[PDB]
Amino acid sequence: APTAPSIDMYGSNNLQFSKIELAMETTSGYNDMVKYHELAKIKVKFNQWSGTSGDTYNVYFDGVKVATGAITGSQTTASFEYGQGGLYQMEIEACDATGCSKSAPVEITIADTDGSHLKPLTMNVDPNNKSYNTDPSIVMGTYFVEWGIYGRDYTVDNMPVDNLTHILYGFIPICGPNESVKSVGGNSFNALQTACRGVNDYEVVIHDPWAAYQKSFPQAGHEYSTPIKGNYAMLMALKQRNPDLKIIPSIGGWTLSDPFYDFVDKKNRDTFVASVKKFLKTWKFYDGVDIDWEFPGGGGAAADKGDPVNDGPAYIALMRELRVMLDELEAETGRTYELTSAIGVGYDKIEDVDYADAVQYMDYIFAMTYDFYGGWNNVPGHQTALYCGSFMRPGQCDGGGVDENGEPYKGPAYTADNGIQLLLAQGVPANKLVLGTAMYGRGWEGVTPDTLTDPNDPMTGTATGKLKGSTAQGVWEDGVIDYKGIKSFMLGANNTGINGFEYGYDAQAEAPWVWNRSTGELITFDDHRSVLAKGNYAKSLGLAGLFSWEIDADNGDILNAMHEGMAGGVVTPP
Numbered sequence: 001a002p003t004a005p006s007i008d009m010y011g012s013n014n015l016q017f018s019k020i021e022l023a024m025e026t027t028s029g030y031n032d033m034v035k036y037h038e039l040a041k042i043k044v045k046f047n048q049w050s051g052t053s054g055d056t057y058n059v060y061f062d063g064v065k066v067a068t069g070a071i072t073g074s075q076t077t078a079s080f081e082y083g084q085g086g087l088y089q090m091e092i093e094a095c096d097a098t099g100c101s102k103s104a105p106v107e108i109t110i111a112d113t114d115g116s117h118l119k120p121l122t123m124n125v126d127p128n129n130k131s132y133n134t135d136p137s138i139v140m141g142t143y144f145v146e147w148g149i150y151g152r153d154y155t156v157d158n159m160p161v162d163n164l165t166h167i168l169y170g171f172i173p174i175c176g177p178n179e180s181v182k183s184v185g186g187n188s189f190n191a192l193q194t195a196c197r198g199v200n201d202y203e204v205v206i207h208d209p210w211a212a213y214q215k216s217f218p219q220a221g222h223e224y225s226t227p228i229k230g231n232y233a234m235l236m237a238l239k240q241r242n243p244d245l246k247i248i249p250s251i252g253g254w255t256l257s258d259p260f261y262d263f264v265d266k267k268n269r270d271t272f273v274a275s276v277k278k279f280l281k282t283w284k285f286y287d288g289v290d291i292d293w294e295f296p297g298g299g300g301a302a303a304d305k306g307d308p309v310n311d312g313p314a315y316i317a318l319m320r321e322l323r324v325m326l327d328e329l330e331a332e333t334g335r336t337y338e339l340t341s342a343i344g345v346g347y348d349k350i351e352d353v354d355y356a357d358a359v360q361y362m363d364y365i366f367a368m369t370y371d372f373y374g375g376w377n378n379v380p381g382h383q384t385a386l387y388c389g390s391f392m393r394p395g396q397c398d399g400g401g402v403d404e405n406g407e408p409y410k411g412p413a414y415t416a417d418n419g420i421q422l423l424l425a426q427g428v429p430a431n432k433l434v435l436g437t438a439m440y441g442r443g444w445e446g447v448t449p450d451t452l453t454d455p456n457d458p459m460t461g462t463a464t465g466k467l468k469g470s471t472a473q474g475v476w477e478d479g480v481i482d483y484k485g486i487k488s489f490m491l492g493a494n495n496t497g498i499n500g501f502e503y504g505y506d507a508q509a510e511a512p513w514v515w516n517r518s519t520g521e522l523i524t525f526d527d528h529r530s531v532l533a534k535g536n537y538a539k540s541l542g543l544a545g546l547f548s549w550e551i552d553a554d555n556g557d558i559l560n561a562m563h564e565g566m567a568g569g570v571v572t573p574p
């Protein structure tokens with residue numbers, strides 16, 4: 001028989017092959033950094049110095065033949081293509097008429113962006129996240145933000161994945177006009193210019209390739225030479241651990257919505273839809289697409305953009321077009337893909353899209369039932385309430401009244417139920433609506449007792465400015481605080497108030513607050529009670545479930561209350 005092949009490990013890239021080529025140690029345009037191949041090119045060098053070399057070789061993976069070719073004397077290179085990622089025991093055999101001899105088996109890795117070559121991720125979850133047996137029909141969603149791996153120090157292996165059905169990854173930008181990104185400060189707009197170099201406008205890109213796929217995380221077993229690293233490699237390993245988890249890229253958001261306003265022109269929608277198909281074929285751990293255009297008709301970050309006439313029909317066409325493209329991918333892959341969108345729930349946002357039309361294309365609507373009041377002005381109120389608070393004036397709730405100056409309210413006040421009823425009344429199915437919970441507060445300072453028109457209620461006061469604080473307190477920008485910050489700095493373990501704060505609750509609105517009467521610091525947020533109320537409301541109306549913004553700001557209490565409030569409930573999936 002021929003001499004047995006001896007595999008030249010170093011001549012064969014130590015048997016590590018990848019279907020994706022990712023640029024490391026540089027930041028450049030997306031199409032220069034990211035190259036995907038439907039088949040891996042496998043090249044393995046072997047030698048047969050002693051004896052006869054034979055005529056033909058065969059390559060086996062886990063004892064099954066996967067390739068054959070000719071022997072070329074004393075040194076041969078087996079080259080073939082392979083589609084399926086994984087770890088395999090490889091043997092190379094040489095054959096001629098006298099018989100066949102085979103190399104010792106050696107492990108070959110073929111990396112793919114489904115994580116098929118990876119072991120389940122090792123988790124490091126705060127044990128204050130408890131175990132539940134929520135029915136699997138109910139949505140339990142959250143957003144994980146790409147930048148939370150820096151100062152926020154919150155990584156993929158910190159998420160309480162057993163308690164989540166859907167992780168929305170915030171956020172994939174669209175190349176094009178993006179002046180609103182300058183409001184984040186820092187390198188964000190410039191990093192986007194770099195990512196979009198050589199990329200057509202209206203195509204998606206990765207905003208931060210360091211965080212997405214270059215950074216080595218030691219908890220994930222990454223090495224500098226590992227071919228996929230970052231958050232994305234951890235998300236692939238997380239999908240191996242929890243295969244029924246849905247991980248969905250969120251495109252846009254408040255900061256990154258400026259290109260959507262140009263989707264009135266179908267040519268820019270076609271460019272975008274094709275880029276998203278490409279993106280989902282490249283990053284196979286993703287399960288659909290979430291569109292967070294804030295907002296059709298304007299009212300977002302870009303004060304000079306928004307078309308109340310034309311953006312709704314653009315949004316609806318976008319959904320129709322995306323769903324045609326996702327049906328293509330389902331045909332091609334045999335998988336199921338979801339299409340979702342997070343939306344504004346003020347009456348002035350909902351009036352600009354005919355959701356009765358759009359929702360036929362969509363699996364879920366993530367209703368942004370938060371941010372109703374905030375430090376952008378000096379008017380206190382409940383930022384994430386279900387119902388109208390005590391502080392509101394007569395007629396403010398339904399919009400028929402007049403304000404303190406005699407001026408008509410223009411529409412119903414910003415509460416979750418005013419928005420959810422407007423969507424239900426036009427025929428959006430309850431089982432496609434997901435209700436938002438906040439894992440953060442918004443706040444003011446200067447709300448001292450002398451400013452209240454009702455002494456029992458600080459939401460009747462007036463502020464002098466935004467809440468101020470440090471990042472160790474969870475205050476990453478003035479006026480906003482992480483829930484885990486409110487717990488450590490204002491509530492305490494017993495939830496009765498520390499550091500001069502007192503807790504209160506508006507039982508009509510279903511909304512908690514903490515208030516320090518000395519400093520006038522007042523923070524509106526969601527807590528165990530108000531999230532239980534949201535779960536109960538979701539069970540009562542047959543909503544699909546709950547989601548939250550943003551997971552890194554919870555200490556487990558808010559996700560636990562999301563589950564607790566849904567106990568017993570089931571829903572018909574869309």
Ligand SMILES: Cc1cc(N)c2ccccc2[n+]1CCCCCCCCCC[n+]1c(C)cc(N)c2ccccc21
Pocket residue numbers: 147171184188207253254255256371376
């Ligand atoms: C930090 C960070 C870090 C990054 N690398 C980053 C990268 C990409 C995108 C965002 C990024 N972010 C920022 C992510 C920002 C998430 C939250 C944005 C919503 C802000 C509230 C919106 N809002 C509402 C609703 C109503 C108002 N009247 C109003 C008035 C003034 C200002 C805002 C107002």
